[PDB]
Each structure stands twice: as structure tokens, then as C-alpha cells.
């Protein structure tokens, strides 16, 4: 439970339609006040998705949430991309790089837990 509970803050976020999944979507979404928590890959390739979304979320005003995690293929199952098959093993999905969140669909204590790790260590 050492900071891999970001799945459950994302999973309750999806049920209240609050993930602007996708490089195009996220970049559009976080170029407004919608940017509420952001999740990034470490690096996929060629370093420029890494440059681009970081510079937009590093604006000179308060809107700087940023969380740095591992490769994208896991991350799509960490978000909602449907591969349930009513819990069956089959992965029919792809992996996203940048998920930006709006409104997080919840009141979770893990939601309480997560920002504090984002704030204090």
C-alpha cells in the first residue's frame, strides 16, 4: 500500500466521468482550470511528451499538481480502459500516458491520503 493506491482514486474518478485521458484530451483539459490532479509516465520515448505536458502543468500560477509513475501499459488498466470481461483475464486495451483528473468522483480517505504524500514526505 506504498503509493500504488492511485488506482483507486482514479477508479472512483472514472465513475463520475472525470478523466481526460489522452495526450490531446489532457493538454486541452489542463490548459484551463480543469487540472485537479495529473498523472504522468516516467518516460515512454523521445522525451517530448515528457517536456510538453510538464511545461503546461508548470504554469506561473497555483495549478501545479503532478505525479510521476511507471510505464504506460500498466497505466491504462490503472485508469478505466475496459478489459473486465466480467473480471476475466483478457486485456483488450492499450495504455495511456497522461491522465488528468477533474473532480475525482469521491470523498475517499485514500483521496485524503494521496494529497498529503503530494504535500509532505
Amino acid at each position: 500500500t506504498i503509493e500504488d493506491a492511485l488506482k483507486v482514486v482514479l477508479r472512483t474518478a472514472l465513475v463520475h466521468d472525470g478523466l481526460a485521458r489522452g495526450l490531446r484530451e489532457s493538454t486541452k483539459a489542463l490548459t484551463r482550470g480543469e487540472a485537479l490532479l495529473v498523472v504522468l509516465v516516467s518516460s515512454v520515448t523521445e522525451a517530448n511528451i515528457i517536456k510538453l505536458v510538464e511545461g503546461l502543468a508548470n504554469d506561473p500560477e497555483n495549478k501545479v499538481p503532478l505525479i510521476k509513475v511507471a510505464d504506460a501499459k500498466q497505466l491504462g488498466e490503472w485508469a478505466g480502459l475496459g478489459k473486465i470481461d466480467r473480471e476475466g483475464n483478457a486485456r483488450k486495451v492499450v495504455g495511456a500516458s497522461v491522465v488528468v483528473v477533474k473532480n475525482w468522483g469521491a470523498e475517499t480517505d485514500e483521496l485524503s491520503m494521496i494529497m498529503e504524500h503530494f504535500s509532505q514526505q
Binding site: R24, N48, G55
Partner: peptide, 8 residues
């Protein structure tokens, strides 16, 4: 690759 705002 799309979303070419500018890069600085």
C-alpha cells in the same frame, strides 16, 4: 503527433 502549441 498533434497538440503543437509551441515549444520554448
Amino acid at each position: 503527433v498533434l497538440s503543437y502549441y509551441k515549444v520554448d
